[PDB]
Amino acid sequence: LLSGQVALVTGGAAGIGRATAQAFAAAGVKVVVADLDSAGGEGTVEAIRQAGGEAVFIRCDVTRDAEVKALVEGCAAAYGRLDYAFNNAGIEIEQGKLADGNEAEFDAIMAVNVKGVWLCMKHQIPLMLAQGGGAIVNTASVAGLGAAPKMSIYAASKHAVIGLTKSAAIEYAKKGIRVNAVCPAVIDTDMFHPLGRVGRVEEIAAAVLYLCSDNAGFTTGIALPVDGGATAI
Amino acid sequence: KLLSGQVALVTGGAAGIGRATAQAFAAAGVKVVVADLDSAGGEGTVEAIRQAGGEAVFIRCDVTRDAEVKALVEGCAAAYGRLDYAFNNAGIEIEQGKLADGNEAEFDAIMAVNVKGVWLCMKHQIPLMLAQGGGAIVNTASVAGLGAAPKMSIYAASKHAVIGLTKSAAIEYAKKGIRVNAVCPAVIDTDMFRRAYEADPRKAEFAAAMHPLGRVGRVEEIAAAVLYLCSDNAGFTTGIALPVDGGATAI
Amino acid sequence: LLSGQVALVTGGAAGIGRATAQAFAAAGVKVVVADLDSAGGEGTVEAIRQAGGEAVFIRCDVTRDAEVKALVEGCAAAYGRLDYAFNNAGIEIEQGKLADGNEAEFDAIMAVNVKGVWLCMKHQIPLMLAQGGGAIVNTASVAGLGAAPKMSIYAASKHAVIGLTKSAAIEYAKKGIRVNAVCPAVIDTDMFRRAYAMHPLGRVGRVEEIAAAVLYLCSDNAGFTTGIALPVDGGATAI
Amino acid sequence: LLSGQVALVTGGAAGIGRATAQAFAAAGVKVVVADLDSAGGEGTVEAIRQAGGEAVFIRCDVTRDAEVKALVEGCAAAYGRLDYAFNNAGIEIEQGKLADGNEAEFDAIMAVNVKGVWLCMKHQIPLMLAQGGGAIVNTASVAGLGAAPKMSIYAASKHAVIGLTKSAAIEYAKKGIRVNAVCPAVIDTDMFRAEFAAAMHPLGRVGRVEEIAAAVLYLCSDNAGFTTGIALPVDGGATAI
Numbered sequence A: 001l002l003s004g005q006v007a008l009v010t011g012g013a014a015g016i017g018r019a020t021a022q023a024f025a026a027a028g029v030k031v032v033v034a035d036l037d038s039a040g041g042e043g044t045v046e047a048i049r050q051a052g053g054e055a056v057f058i059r060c061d062v063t064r065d066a067e068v069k070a071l072v073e074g075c076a077a078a079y080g081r082l083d084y085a086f087n088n089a090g091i092e093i094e095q096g097k098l099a100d101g102n103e104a105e106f107d108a109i110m111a112v113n114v115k116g117v118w119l120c121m122k123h124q125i126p127l128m129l130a131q132g133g134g135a136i137v138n139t140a141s142v143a144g145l146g147a148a149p150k151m152s153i154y155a156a157s158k159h160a161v162i163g164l165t166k167s168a169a170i171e172y173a174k175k176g177i178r179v180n181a182v183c184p185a186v187i188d189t190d191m192f193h194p195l196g197r198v199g200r201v202e203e204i205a206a207a208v209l210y211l212c213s214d215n216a217g218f219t220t221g222i223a224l225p226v227d228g229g230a231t232a233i
Numbered sequence B: 001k002l003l004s005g006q007v008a009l010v011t012g013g014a015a016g017i018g019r020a021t022a023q024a025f026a027a028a029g030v031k032v033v034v035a036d037l038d039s040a041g042g043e044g045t046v047e048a049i050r051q052a053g054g055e056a057v058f059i060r061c062d063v064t065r066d067a068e069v070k071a072l073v074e075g076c077a078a079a080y081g082r083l084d085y086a087f088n089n090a091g092i093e094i095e096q097g098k099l100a101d102g103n104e105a106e107f108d109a110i111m112a113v114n115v116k117g118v119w120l121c122m123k124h125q126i127p128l129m130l131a132q133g134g135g136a137i138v139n140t141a142s143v144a145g146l147g148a149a150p151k152m153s154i155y156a157a158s159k160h161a162v163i164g165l166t167k168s169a170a171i172e173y174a175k176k177g178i179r180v181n182a183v184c185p186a187v188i189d190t191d192m193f194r195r196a197y198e199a200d201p202r203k204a205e206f207a208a209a210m211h212p213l214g215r216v217g218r219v220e221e222i223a224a225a226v227l228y229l230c231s232d233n234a235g236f237t238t239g240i241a242l243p244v245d246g247g248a249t250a251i
Numbered sequence C: 001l002l003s004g005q006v007a008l009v010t011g012g013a014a015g016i017g018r019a020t021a022q023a024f025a026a027a028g029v030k031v032v033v034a035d036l037d038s039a040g041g042e043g044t045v046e047a048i049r050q051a052g053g054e055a056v057f058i059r060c061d062v063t064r065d066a067e068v069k070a071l072v073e074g075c076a077a078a079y080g081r082l083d084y085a086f087n088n089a090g091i092e093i094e095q096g097k098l099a100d101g102n103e104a105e106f107d108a109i110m111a112v113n114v115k116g117v118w119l120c121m122k123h124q125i126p127l128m129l130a131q132g133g134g135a136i137v138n139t140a141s142v143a144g145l146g147a148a149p150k151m152s153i154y155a156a157s158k159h160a161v162i163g164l165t166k167s168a169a170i171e172y173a174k175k176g177i178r179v180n181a182v183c184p185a186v187i188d189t190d191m192f193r194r195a196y197a198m199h200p201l202g203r204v205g206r207v208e209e210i211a212a213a214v215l216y217l218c219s220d221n222a223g224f225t226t227g228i229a230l231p232v233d234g235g236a237t238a239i
Numbered sequence D: 001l002l003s004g005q006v007a008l009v010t011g012g013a014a015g016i017g018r019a020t021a022q023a024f025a026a027a028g029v030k031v032v033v034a035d036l037d038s039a040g041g042e043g044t045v046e047a048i049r050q051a052g053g054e055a056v057f058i059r060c061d062v063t064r065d066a067e068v069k070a071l072v073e074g075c076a077a078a079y080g081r082l083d084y085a086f087n088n089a090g091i092e093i094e095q096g097k098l099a100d101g102n103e104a105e106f107d108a109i110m111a112v113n114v115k116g117v118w119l120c121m122k123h124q125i126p127l128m129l130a131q132g133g134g135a136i137v138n139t140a141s142v143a144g145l146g147a148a149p150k151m152s153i154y155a156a157s158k159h160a161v162i163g164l165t166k167s168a169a170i171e172y173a174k175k176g177i178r179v180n181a182v183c184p185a186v187i188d189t190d191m192f193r194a195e196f197a198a199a200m201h202p203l204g205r206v207g208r209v210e211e212i213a214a215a216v217l218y219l220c221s222d223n224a225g226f227t228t229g230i231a232l233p234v235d236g237g238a239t240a241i
């Protein structure tokens, strides 16, 4: 069970973000859905509303500080508080081994996957501090825990997400903010293992909700693999 | 709904983390077999479950004894017909010195309960779960399974070993419907720990200072992690060592 | 022992980079020293030459693709090939917890510590491919293995170095290119004395201890060692 | 590059242990070769002596406290001190997945691989303390860092080696004793002498005994004084995934 009232999900227009927004709402939480994709983001808000939940869509490019600042202000204006943040927007666009990549790809992946998470947390934390605490979950990857051949920039970016996650967890541990990362392997989304199958968006959402749950109060600074056994070998 | 399995086995269920997790399973609607050397504490866990409206039974078992563990798993099927979830949580922590100051009796005792006990339990749980087409196992490791434990080197070795058993079994049985995970608690406030720091408050001050959160963990927090690892929507989660540690391993 | 002929050290004007440049040269390797700090970089080369070794300084801002390209080609122009690369240039400039940092600090740290390593590797690898091999060592940090309070951007950047390292190690494992990261804790350099008992050993590390770890990772008998993050930390990560 | 005078190598009669004993001796260190196998052990000593080095053989079952104590005493008896210890004796004997294993296998693997390392360190440490320091390397495995299907007891045992290593490293850090683990993947030992195991390494081959020996010597080297409590994978990329 979740007793906080408001969650923010970035990248909530599709895939893991949409599923996790829906899961928060089904648990009784008011959800701000943030994304570049306004069509999909309103699609997520409408699915929540048709199921009996509360949700608003706010368009935001997480690479832009002013828009992320406005997004967290929008959370406060819409619902008065922010208890949970799922910083999940990310991209994966590489086509080759490290020597065959280009600087445009590097810049784009790092901007969304690292700067986006950093900016989001940078603006979420003061609002959570004002309320006496909160819980943040960042989407890393099994590529944040080991090699990702032909996705070396992506792996660098998801490693970096774990570094931000652990550092913020320690910095704000005594201030009521928990910070964790979920580390999916291959998940059946549009961006698309010892168990012999790929994972499902509902399985990532369930892990995010565990990390945000009332009885996860002692869980902070971890990178939770949801990976069908991939990192165990 | 979150756990659709019918039957859980908790070893070390007479006290502490095991007692609380047995209660958490029962509160979720699961019938619980409580296994322990401590008959009094074990029947006490069962009584608390029953008074709360759940179902449980106690089966005495020394997890270091192969014949007793085999009979314990047989007793689960006799009592409730199957075994969906197993929490292999019995363990001891008895060292008093640095590595060169420990003794072979301590080594043998710690390794027997903490490693052989987990191995025996899995050895007899897995065939039952194979026959059912699936099951989930959670083993109690520790933050000492993930890093040094000064003045507890044998304990650390034993909890590292639990993670090795966990990951190996997770890969071996992944395609047979069995998931195997480990929970890695830091210091948890059990009834025994509380008695200890009531007599010596420095133990509470020191233990809280070991964790970035500035407190020790709660038995209900370990229980909730175990139930997550057993939950229906944790079907893609296997072979992990989940720290529940107030940030301790993030440092 | 090291059978390769040519090493490149970025951030070689000072500290860990200077000591590792000197160590390569002591092992008989010709060294290209690269840094923004020309006076320090020429100082490293002067010290190597004064001890009987061979080295040259090439000024390079590792955040700039064209400068890194010219630097790597300059290695081949000076000495004919490039067998070893120590991608060690880095900065540490944060002054607050995550929510107190600023975007300029983020951009600067990520540019040197992540883009610099990525650019260096992407232009070192083609030469090593043509050679049938090489050894790359990237300077990560214990901050790439765990939290670094009040240095969250730095920790993100050094985590990213490990991701680059492991990914390239797998990509090129069958092409003879080993890629590893050394992970120092606090080392007694100007980066440390600028910032002004956390280490179980009771002291901070020495630059020659990092250099020795780099040289092990580059050594002929390290041919089965790739994709690792080697902590040189007085025990810090073992807790 | 190694200023210590005396190294002890357990499991020194064959394979990684023989190779590391030879490497120590080639670096000018005096070597105590320790093993159950007296014939292979003296063979290691003979190879060292043929190359101009200094070694002796001492028989020891590392599962027996009295023999391990006598082994360390024997190091001091032969050479006066003990600077380096490579606790490398180990076995790998399982035949099936976890539920198909047996208790005799469990007991044997844990006794050599865990108790043997524990006993060795327990008796090495006081001698090193009295000298003002020393360096210990324990042989773990990639199976100490992840799953080993059909070798679950072995994986448990090598995980345990890493736990002993890290704990002792922190306990004795300020007393000058460094404690590290080397973590080999598949190594071409005379027992190994197939193509399937080679292919599961990203490098595409199995490792050489000389590559493990060189990692042990780095961990014992004079300029490894800030390296302690680590598990060093020598694995052709296996653990980088």
Ligand SMILES: NC(=O)c1ccc[n+]([C@@H]2O[C@H](COP(=O)([O-])OP(=O)(O)OC[C@H]3O[C@@H](n4cnc5c(N)ncnc54)[C@H](O)[C@@H]3O)[C@@H](O)[C@H]2O)c1
Pocket: A010, A011, A012, A013, A014, A015, A016, A017, A034, A035, A036, A037, A040, A060, A061, A062, A063, A088, A089, A090, A091, A092, A112, A116, A139, A140, A141, A142, A184, A185, A186, A187, A188, A189, A190, A191, A192
């Ligand atoms: N197999 C997988 O899908 C997989 C595996 C590992 C990690 N991940 C990570 O999971 C997270 C979600 O992945 P997904 O599979 O649901 O991807 P997805 O393709 O379904 O969409 C992710 C969302 O992020 C949005 N987005 C992208 N850039 C944005 C930006 N600058 N600002 C705001 N929104 C932006 C997109 O519009 C999209 O709605 C990502 O961070 C991804 O890297 C995914």
Ligand SMILES: NC(=O)c1ccc[n+]([C@@H]2O[C@H](COP(=O)([O-])OP(=O)(O)OC[C@H]3O[C@@H](n4cnc5c(N)ncnc54)[C@H](O)[C@@H]3O)[C@@H](O)[C@H]2O)c1
Pocket: B011, B012, B013, B014, B015, B016, B017, B018, B035, B036, B037, B038, B041, B061, B062, B063, B064, B089, B090, B091, B092, B093, B113, B117, B140, B141, B142, B143, B185, B186, B187, B188, B189, B190, B192
């Ligand atoms: N701070 C903590 O409490 C902490 C921290 C890390 C790990 N752990 C681990 O949590 C698990 C339970 O911890 P706890 O604090 O609740 O301990 P506890 O002493 O309060 O309960 C442990 C139970 O295990 C039983 N037991 C011991 N040996 C047994 C045997 N051979 N056969 C059957 N039962 C046996 C005991 O009778 C006891 O009821 C253990 O594995 C422990 O190592 C605990």
Ligand SMILES: NC(=O)c1ccc[n+]([C@@H]2O[C@H](COP(=O)([O-])OP(=O)(O)OC[C@H]3O[C@@H](n4cnc5c(N)ncnc54)[C@H](O)[C@@H]3O)[C@@H](O)[C@H]2O)c1
Pocket: C010, C011, C012, C013, C014, C015, C016, C017, C034, C035, C036, C037, C040, C060, C061, C062, C063, C088, C089, C090, C091, C092, C112, C116, C139, C140, C141, C142, C184, C185, C186, C187, C188, C189, C190, C191, C192
């Ligand atoms: N000293 C420590 O405690 C410590 C700890 C962990 C990691 N590190 C890392 O070790 C490496 C070396 O640091 P150091 O301790 O020797 O400090 P240092 O500042 O003395 O050396 C860093 C070198 O990198 C150069 N440099 C910076 N930006 C550059 C750029 N864009 N292009 C080219 N050169 C550039 C600098 O001029 C300098 O000479 C860095 O990557 C650092 O992040 C240091």
Ligand SMILES: NC(=O)c1ccc[n+]([C@@H]2O[C@H](COP(=O)([O-])OP(=O)(O)OC[C@H]3O[C@@H](n4cnc5c(N)ncnc54)[C@H](O)[C@@H]3O)[C@@H](O)[C@H]2O)c1
Pocket: D010, D011, D012, D013, D014, D015, D016, D017, D034, D035, D036, D037, D040, D060, D061, D062, D063, D088, D089, D090, D091, D092, D112, D116, D139, D140, D141, D142, D184, D185, D186, D187, D188, D189, D190, D191, D192
């Ligand atoms: N593929 C590999 O070879 C591999 C991989 C990972 C780890 N390891 C580990 O490397 C170490 C050496 O392995 P190896 O491949 O050289 O094996 P090996 O069988 O060739 O040599 C092992 C030596 O240990 C000795 N030994 C066994 N039990 C002993 C005991 N109780 N007391 C004293 N000596 C004993 C043996 O007599 C033998 O000489 C072991 O710890 C092993 O577990 C080996």
